[PDB]
Amino acid sequence: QPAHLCFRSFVEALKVDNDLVEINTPIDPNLEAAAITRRVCETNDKAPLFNNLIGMKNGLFRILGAPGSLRKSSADRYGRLARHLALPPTASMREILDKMLSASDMPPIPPTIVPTGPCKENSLDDSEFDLTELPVPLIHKSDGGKYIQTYGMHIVQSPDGTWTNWSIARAMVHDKNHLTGLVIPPQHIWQIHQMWKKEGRSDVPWALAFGVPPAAIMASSMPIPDGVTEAGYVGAMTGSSLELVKCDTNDLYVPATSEIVLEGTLSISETGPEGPFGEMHGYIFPGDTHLGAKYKVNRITYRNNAIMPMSSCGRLTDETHTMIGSLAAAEIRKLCQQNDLPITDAFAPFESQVTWVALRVDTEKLRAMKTTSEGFRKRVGDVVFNHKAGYTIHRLVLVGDDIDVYEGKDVLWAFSTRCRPGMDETLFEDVRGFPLIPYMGHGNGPAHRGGKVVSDALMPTEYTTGRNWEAADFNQSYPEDLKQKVLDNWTKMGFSHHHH
Amino acid sequence: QPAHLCFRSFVEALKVDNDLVEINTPIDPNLEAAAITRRVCETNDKAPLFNNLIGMKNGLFRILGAPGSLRKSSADRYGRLARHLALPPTASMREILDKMLSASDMPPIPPTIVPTGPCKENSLDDSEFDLTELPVPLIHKSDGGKYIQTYGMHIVQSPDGTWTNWSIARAMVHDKNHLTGLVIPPQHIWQIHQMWKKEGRSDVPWALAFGVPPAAIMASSMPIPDGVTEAGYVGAMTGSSLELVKCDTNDLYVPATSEIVLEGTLSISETGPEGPFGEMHGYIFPGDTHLGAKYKVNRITYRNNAIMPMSSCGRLTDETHTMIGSLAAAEIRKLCQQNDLPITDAFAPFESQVTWVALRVDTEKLRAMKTTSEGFRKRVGDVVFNHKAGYTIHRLVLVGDDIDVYEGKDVLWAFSTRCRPGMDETLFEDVRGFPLIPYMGHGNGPAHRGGKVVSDALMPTEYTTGRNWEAADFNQSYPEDLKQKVLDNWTKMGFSHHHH
Ligand SMILES: Cc1cc2c3c(c1C)C(C)(C)CC=[N+]3c1c([nH]c(=O)[nH]c1=O)N2C[C@H](O)[C@H](O)[C@H](O)COP(=O)(O)O
Ligand SMILES: Cc1cc2c3c(c1C)C(C)(C)CC=[N+]3c1c([nH]c(=O)[nH]c1=O)N2C[C@H](O)[C@H](O)[C@H](O)COP(=O)(O)O
Ligand SMILES: O=C(O)/C=C/c1c(F)c(F)c(F)c(F)c1F
Ligand SMILES: O=C(O)/C=C/c1c(F)c(F)c(F)c(F)c1F
Ligand SMILES: [K+]
Ligand SMILES: [K+]
Ligand SMILES: [K+]
Ligand SMILES: [K+]
Ligand SMILES: [Mn+2]
Ligand SMILES: [Mn+2]
């Protein structure tokens, strides 16, 4: 099976790429696996495959860390993401995001049901498993639980059957047969949960599949529109219908090659302690436990020699940056364009801890709009910050066509030099805020409202007659023939490879 | 003579450090020298010494580019600055700034007058030189003149004789015997100029010395207090009285080993076209010429085989970042401490284009103040933004003790995650602004007023009971013994030198 369609094949691909370290000696799921993975992520090293996890029994489980993190070289920096999508390992972030947006003006390709798959190789009923006995990692030393779920896909379906959502939301072990996790607005797992609560008749049928097709985990991490079934979006993106098998204890369908599947229910009534967790912004607040959603597990099925993916998230750079930020930015770009805004590109700079999105403006279009900064900032901010795709993003930085928004140095240069604090910004206090940012949920104001800003780093003439500067840099401050001479004579004079 | 006391010795030291490329073939001062230097600065390469400058005649002149720019390795990143100060080449930025502040609570050591020095080896009277015939560089292709003066020291003295200021301010050739340059408030060259204008009786006696003692050019770039003679501050910092020789045509005194000296007058009445120039923030606005101050040159003296230092300034990283930003930050740190503010460290992040200063707060002291963010931000901003040391800085970022302000990644992390836009900031519109920032002088508001902000990246409990988080990073999220195990086993497992 191709790597983008099968997690086991994906692991092989990382090995073949020389992007994998297999660790065959015993590794403790209590902090050690996650510490190694954390160091990987902070250094852009090879992904760790823990083949000999202390506490593994009867095939549950090995761990792959850092599935969507960065490689060291510039040339294949995003190669791990490219391997989720059948793209060349040298693919640019623009190409990755375009691939992830491509299904948005395609017909869905619904999934295909097949009678069995590797995810049925082994099973454990409700008398045979105990979640507290599995080698579930403690990821950060102050976490409030063992976070089994950092890179699996929750599957829930609307009561009427018409929308099946796939998404990543964290969850931790509560007891032998339950998890607790975050289920918060405006996320689709929350929106579906609310539909079941209002019906009031039963708990939500649920499954959690780990080690799913890589292209599916990418869509699981992306804020595609309300009501859109991820399976059919992934089918259209990949050009192939995904093969799914029915759960044994409910009528949900899971990817046939899933490594591990939990089947059960998400309660419409019960809660339990959840968190704290070392989160995407780089912090944990020890002792900050709050009530979260509660899941009951009735059945586990799994592949022979099952592998659990894990994100050891926190400070730069991991899946919470590469996937959450970039995929939100992609959806924002599209949303802006659909609202007739002249946005060509969007990216969440890593330097901002993916709390900013830089929006590249087609300034020729802007000029034809015959508008002003105040008006344009307000329009952009209303579109983005009133939409779910803007949820996680607290600052939008508008930049003109000279800036490559995928290069954080250039975004920071433009922000710092072209946006006058205050005057060139519009604050938004009456929009939904992202409570997980420390200055929100642990800050001075409402955790759930406001704290957003549009920062205009467009210069005045970009609205009127066109750019009126040149950069004071090697590229723009010297003629072509001179630059080329300098470059040709560089090593000859005494001064100091792309791939590496 | 030691390197910090003699520019010629400084050049030798760079050679001995393997931090110099001597270019002995012909190089054009029309853009080529500056293009090479620009590429050096953008790549942290070795400093270029242009020994064979097209248009050099009778000893005027060779060029050294990039005198205060960065080296590639982390270990000696600031080595060129350390060589200005007699510090080891591995000196930290903290150590460099502390050296530059050290003279602030020392008695001055006034200069010593000697009868001659190398700067008298050659001379040209007013019938023998023409500034338009010298190999003065065109530094950026759109510059409005040939900027002879990018790393020399202007010398002017108050009418009463009591204060002699040394400072860097740009200047360009106007004609055979005049320069034009920037002389703007609140700079000390401007303040002295105003004293002469109010007296109304004569032009200001002036000299411009190029290739001065490196320790003197560093103080020339620093906003030490009003009324303080730089020569005596440099004497105290270095522990030695500087040796100066009298000008021939006026009674000012110049460093004995200056490479090149211009003697003349800064007019109290006349102006001429000045600029545009590719500036510290990374831009040039072609065609933006305005009237500047006008200098008349009466005499040139110079060393045999004179060397002119040059800054090819613009986008990161050059002397306008390493020296302007860092030295302002140092003076701000001191100013804050003298105003009883609990500031331990300050630095201007390069990522901000040195328009921010991050201020590290001693949060134990803060807690004893029993204050709030609103109050504290206002107090810090009033102290800094009402003072000349704050002139160039438009954003202050307050951070707690965990943040190393000399590491821009960490400042950006703290700013983006701990300062709620709007709520945690105080805007200052009634303070002097720095017009050279594009969003000021080419922006939407007054060029000279406002546009400043204090951004509080202190978290709420840092004012009250103490930090209540741990970072979700390798350092803080795992116990000591585990980290050390991981590190010890790193290469054994299969994962990937300080000097490099
Ligand atoms: C990649 C990724 C995405 C996380 C995520 C993580 C990763 C690795 C974790 C597991 C390591 C840490 C926490 N995460 C949560 C999360 N969204 C959410 O509501 N709760 C979470 O707990 N997300 C983001 C969520 O997947 C995106 O917002 C999706 O758009 C949600 O899909 P939906 O649009 O269908 O609701
Ligand atoms: C290092 C450095 C400092 C420049 C500078 C440059 C460099 C290389 C240039 C020459 C390449 C470009 C322009 N610069 C000017 C400048 N200050 C100023 O008023 N006008 C300038 O034109 N400065 C900053 C000035 O030296 C500091 O603000 C000092 O504090 C001024 O000394 P003072 O406090 O005695 O007034
Ligand atoms: O646990 C964490 O670090 C991230 C939780 C998280 C997320 F990353 C998101 F993008 C969300 F939209 C969301 F609602 C979340 F709760
Ligand atoms: O020409 C340039 O790029 C810088 C001019 C400049 C400067 F760098 C400063 F720090 C000043 F304080 C100042 F007044 C200036 F004019
Ligand atoms: K999704
Ligand atoms: K602007
Ligand atoms: K000075
Ligand atoms: K704050
Ligand atoms: Mn969805
Ligand atoms: Mn001074």
Side-chain angles (χ1 to χ4, degrees), chain A residues 1-56 58-71 73-125 127-175 177-200 202-269 271-377 379-408 410-466 468-491 493-495 497-499, chain B residues 1-56 58-71 73-125 127-175 177-200 202-269 271-377 379-408 410-466 468-491 493-495 497-499:
Chain A
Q1 299 238 352
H4 65 297
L5 300 175
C6 174
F7 182 85
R8 191 70 62 97
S9 297
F10 171 81
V11 174
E12 291 313 292
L14 299 186
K15 175 175 213 161
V16 166
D17 279 2
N18 191 30
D19 191 38
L20 197 63
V21 169
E22 296 195 76
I23 308 172
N24 299 322
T25 54
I27 292 293
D28 204 328
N30 179 22
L31 296 171
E32 187 180 25
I36 291 165
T37 302
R38 185 90 290 269
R39 178 73 164 187
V40 165
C41 292
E42 293 181 19
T43 64
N44 304 337
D45 215 322
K46 295 180 186 177
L49 177 63
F50 307 98
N51 287 323
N52 192 351
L53 187 76
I54 296 169
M56 76 189 309
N58 297 330
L60 286 172
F61 38 71
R62 298 151 69 193
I63 286 174
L64 178 72
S69 294
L70 301 177
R71 299 184 176 176
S73 305
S74 67
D76 70 340
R77 174 68 49 72
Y78 305 114
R80 218 180 273 155
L81 297 175
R83 290 302 185 210
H84 283 71
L85 296 176
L87 294 168
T90 47
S92 67
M93 176 64 62
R94 173 68 192 203
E95 287 168 340
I96 289 162
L97 298 183
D98 287 349
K99 182 59 166 187
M100 291 303 307
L101 285 168
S102 67
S104 72
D105 72 348
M106 300 177 177
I109 304 182
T112 294
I113 301 172
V114 298
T116 196
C119 73
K120 302 295 190 176
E121 290 166 355
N122 307 273
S123 68
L124 300 160
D125 80 22
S127 66
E128 293 169 319
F129 65 83
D130 180 330
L131 297 164
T132 75
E133 293 286 353
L134 295 176
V136 180
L138 186 65
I139 302 182
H140 316 86
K141 71 187 188 174
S142 295
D143 284 350
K146 300 181 183 320
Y147 276 83
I148 195 174
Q149 161 45 15
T150 62
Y151 205 75
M153 178 169 96
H154 291 280
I155 306 169
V156 290
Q157 183 179 96
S158 60
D160 72 8
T162 64
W163 174 25
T164 304
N165 200 77
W166 294 352
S167 61
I168 298 186
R170 73 185 192 208
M172 47 165 269
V173 176
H174 175 77
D175 67 13
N177 64 336
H178 294 82
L179 310 182
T180 58
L182 284 185
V183 174
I184 65 176
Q187 301 295 70
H188 291 164
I189 191 168
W190 181 90
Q191 292 188 17
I192 292 169
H193 173 95
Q194 291 286 112
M195 295 175 189
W196 292 82
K197 190 182 188 160
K198 286 174 202 174
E199 286 210 356
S202 77
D203 298 321
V204 185
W206 162 82
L208 173 53
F210 302 100
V212 299
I217 207 65
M218 292 284 290
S220 296
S221 299
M222 184 176 188
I224 77 169
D226 297 355
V228 178
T229 292
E230 282 73 8
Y233 187 96
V234 178
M237 177 169 68
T238 68
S240 63
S241 177
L242 297 178
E243 297 188 337
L244 313 180
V245 296
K246 202 181 79 73
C247 290
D248 301 330
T249 69
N250 66 40
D251 289 347
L252 300 174
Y253 288 85
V254 298
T257 65
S258 300
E259 296 281 332
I260 307 163
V261 178
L262 310 180
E263 310 180 1
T265 52
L266 163 55
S267 180
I268 60 162
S269 65
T271 57
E274 197 283 329
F277 184 55
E279 299 170 343
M280 67 182 289
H281 303 110
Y283 303 75
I284 185 167
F285 290 76
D288 198 40
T289 304
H290 296 291
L291 287 181
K294 191 172 187 175
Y295 304 84
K296 182 175 189 270
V297 180
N298 295 325
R299 188 167 182 85
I300 306 180
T301 78
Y302 55 105
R303 289 190 70 143
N304 297 331
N305 308 292
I307 305 168
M308 170 66 82
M310 177 187 73
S311 178
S312 183
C313 55
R315 288 200 68 183
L316 295 175
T317 317
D318 62 60
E319 299 67 33
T320 72
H321 318 120
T322 66
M323 295 167 60
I324 303 174
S326 309
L327 300 169
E331 193 71 13
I332 292 167
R333 185 224 303 178
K334 176 185 70 144
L335 173 65
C336 289
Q337 294 174 345
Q338 291 178 335
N339 281 274
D340 298 315
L341 299 171
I343 302 312
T344 69
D345 291 90
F347 188 65
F350 296 134
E351 298 91 333
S352 78
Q353 206 69 23
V354 301
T355 71
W356 304 8
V357 163
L359 299 176
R360 187 175 177 272
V361 176
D362 178 333
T363 66
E364 184 184 19
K365 290 183 184 185
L366 181 67
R367 282 182 278 281
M369 295 167 67
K370 303 284 181 187
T371 194
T372 79
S373 180
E374 282 101 322
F376 188 57
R377 288 184 318 247
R379 192 163 173 207
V380 170
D382 282 344
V383 162
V384 175
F385 295 150
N386 292 303
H387 195 281
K388 172 171 172 298
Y391 169 56
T392 71
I393 302 308
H394 276 247
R395 167 170 262 132
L396 298 169
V397 182
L398 309 177
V399 298
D401 298 73
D402 76 300
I403 302 296
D404 180 353
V405 294
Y406 305 104
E407 291 295 337
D410 299 330
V411 174
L412 288 166
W413 173 60
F415 175 72
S416 295
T417 62
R418 307 178 189 185
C419 178
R420 177 172 167 147
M423 182 170 293
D424 291 349
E425 303 186 298
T426 300
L427 295 159
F428 290 75
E429 295 291 7
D430 193 16
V431 295
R432 192 181 315 267
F434 186 25
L436 278 67
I437 299 172
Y439 66 58
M440 295 303 295
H442 292 100
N444 296 304
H448 303 278
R449 213 84 190 145
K452 302 209 171 189
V453 61
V454 181
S455 296
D456 191 2
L458 293 156
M459 290 291 293
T461 63
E462 299 197 90
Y463 285 87
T464 58
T465 54
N468 64 338
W469 69 92
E470 293 170 344
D473 67 1
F474 182 82
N475 184 42
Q476 296 185 38
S477 266
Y478 304 93
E480 297 297 314
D481 57 358
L482 176 62
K483 289 183 303 169
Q484 192 58 55
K485 181 189 183 188
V486 169
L487 293 186
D488 286 352
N489 295 330
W490 194 249
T491 56
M493 290 183 291
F495 303 104
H497 290 157
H498 173 74
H499 284 287
Chain B
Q1 299 238 352
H4 65 297
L5 300 175
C6 174
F7 182 85
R8 191 70 62 97
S9 297
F10 171 81
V11 174
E12 291 313 292
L14 299 186
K15 175 175 213 161
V16 166
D17 279 2
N18 191 30
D19 191 38
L20 197 63
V21 169
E22 296 195 76
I23 308 172
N24 299 322
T25 54
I27 292 293
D28 204 328
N30 179 22
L31 296 171
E32 187 180 25
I36 291 165
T37 302
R38 185 90 290 269
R39 178 73 164 187
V40 165
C41 292
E42 293 181 19
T43 64
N44 304 337
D45 215 322
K46 295 180 186 177
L49 177 63
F50 307 98
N51 287 323
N52 192 351
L53 187 76
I54 296 169
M56 76 189 309
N58 297 330
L60 286 172
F61 38 71
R62 298 151 69 193
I63 286 174
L64 178 72
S69 294
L70 301 177
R71 299 184 176 176
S73 305
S74 67
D76 70 340
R77 174 68 49 72
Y78 305 114
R80 218 180 273 155
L81 297 175
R83 290 302 185 210
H84 283 71
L85 296 176
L87 294 168
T90 47
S92 67
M93 176 64 62
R94 173 68 192 203
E95 287 168 340
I96 289 162
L97 298 183
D98 287 349
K99 182 59 166 187
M100 291 303 307
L101 285 168
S102 67
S104 72
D105 72 348
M106 300 177 177
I109 304 182
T112 294
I113 301 172
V114 298
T116 196
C119 73
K120 302 295 190 176
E121 290 166 355
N122 307 273
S123 68
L124 300 160
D125 80 22
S127 66
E128 293 169 319
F129 65 83
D130 180 330
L131 297 164
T132 75
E133 293 286 353
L134 295 176
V136 180
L138 186 65
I139 302 182
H140 316 86
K141 71 187 188 174
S142 295
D143 284 350
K146 300 181 183 320
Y147 276 83
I148 195 174
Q149 161 45 15
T150 62
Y151 205 75
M153 178 169 96
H154 291 280
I155 306 169
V156 290
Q157 183 179 96
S158 60
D160 72 8
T162 64
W163 174 25
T164 304
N165 200 77
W166 294 352
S167 61
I168 298 186
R170 73 185 192 208
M172 47 165 269
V173 176
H174 175 77
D175 67 13
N177 64 336
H178 294 82
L179 310 182
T180 58
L182 284 185
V183 174
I184 65 176
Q187 301 295 70
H188 291 164
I189 191 168
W190 181 90
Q191 292 188 17
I192 292 169
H193 173 95
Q194 291 286 112
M195 295 175 189
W196 292 82
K197 190 182 188 160
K198 286 174 202 174
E199 286 210 356
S202 77
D203 298 321
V204 185
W206 162 82
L208 173 53
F210 302 100
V212 299
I217 207 65
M218 292 284 290
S220 296
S221 299
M222 184 176 188
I224 77 169
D226 297 355
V228 178
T229 292
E230 282 73 8
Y233 187 96
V234 178
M237 177 169 68
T238 68
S240 63
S241 177
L242 297 178
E243 297 188 337
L244 313 180
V245 296
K246 202 181 79 73
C247 290
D248 301 330
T249 69
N250 66 40
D251 289 347
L252 300 174
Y253 288 85
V254 298
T257 65
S258 300
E259 296 281 332
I260 307 163
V261 178
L262 310 180
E263 310 180 1
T265 52
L266 163 55
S267 180
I268 60 162
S269 65
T271 57
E274 197 283 329
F277 184 55
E279 299 170 343
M280 67 182 289
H281 303 110
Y283 303 75
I284 185 167
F285 290 76
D288 198 40
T289 304
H290 296 291
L291 287 181
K294 191 172 187 175
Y295 304 84
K296 182 175 189 270
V297 180
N298 295 325
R299 188 167 182 85
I300 306 180
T301 78
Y302 55 105
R303 289 190 70 143
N304 297 331
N305 308 292
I307 305 168
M308 170 66 82
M310 177 187 73
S311 178
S312 183
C313 55
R315 288 200 68 183
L316 295 175
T317 317
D318 62 60
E319 299 67 33
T320 72
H321 318 120
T322 66
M323 295 167 60
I324 303 174
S326 309
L327 300 169
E331 193 71 13
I332 292 167
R333 185 224 303 178
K334 176 185 70 144
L335 173 65
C336 289
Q337 294 174 345
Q338 291 178 335
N339 281 274
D340 298 315
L341 299 171
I343 302 312
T344 69
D345 291 90
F347 188 65
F350 296 134
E351 298 91 333
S352 78
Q353 206 69 23
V354 301
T355 71
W356 304 8
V357 163
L359 299 176
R360 187 175 177 272
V361 176
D362 178 333
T363 66
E364 184 184 19
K365 290 183 184 185
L366 181 67
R367 282 182 278 281
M369 295 167 67
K370 303 284 181 187
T371 194
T372 79
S373 180
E374 282 101 322
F376 188 57
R377 288 184 318 247
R379 192 163 173 207
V380 170
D382 282 344
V383 162
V384 175
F385 295 150
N386 292 303
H387 195 281
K388 172 171 172 298
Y391 169 56
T392 71
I393 302 308
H394 276 247
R395 167 170 262 132
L396 298 169
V397 182
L398 309 177
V399 298
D401 298 73
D402 76 300
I403 302 296
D404 180 353
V405 294
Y406 305 104
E407 291 295 337
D410 299 330
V411 174
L412 288 166
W413 173 60
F415 175 72
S416 295
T417 62
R418 307 178 189 185
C419 178
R420 177 172 167 147
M423 182 170 293
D424 291 349
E425 303 186 298
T426 300
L427 295 159
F428 290 75
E429 295 291 7
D430 193 16
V431 295
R432 192 181 315 267
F434 186 25
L436 278 67
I437 299 172
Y439 66 58
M440 295 303 295
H442 292 100
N444 296 304
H448 303 278
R449 213 84 190 145
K452 302 209 171 189
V453 61
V454 181
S455 296
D456 191 2
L458 293 156
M459 290 291 293
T461 63
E462 299 197 90
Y463 285 87
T464 58
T465 54
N468 64 338
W469 69 92
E470 293 170 344
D473 67 1
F474 182 82
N475 184 42
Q476 296 185 38
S477 266
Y478 304 93
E480 297 297 314
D481 57 358
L482 176 62
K483 289 183 303 169
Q484 192 58 55
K485 181 189 183 188
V486 169
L487 293 186
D488 286 352
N489 295 330
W490 194 249
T491 56
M493 290 183 291
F495 303 104
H497 290 157
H498 173 74
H499 284 287

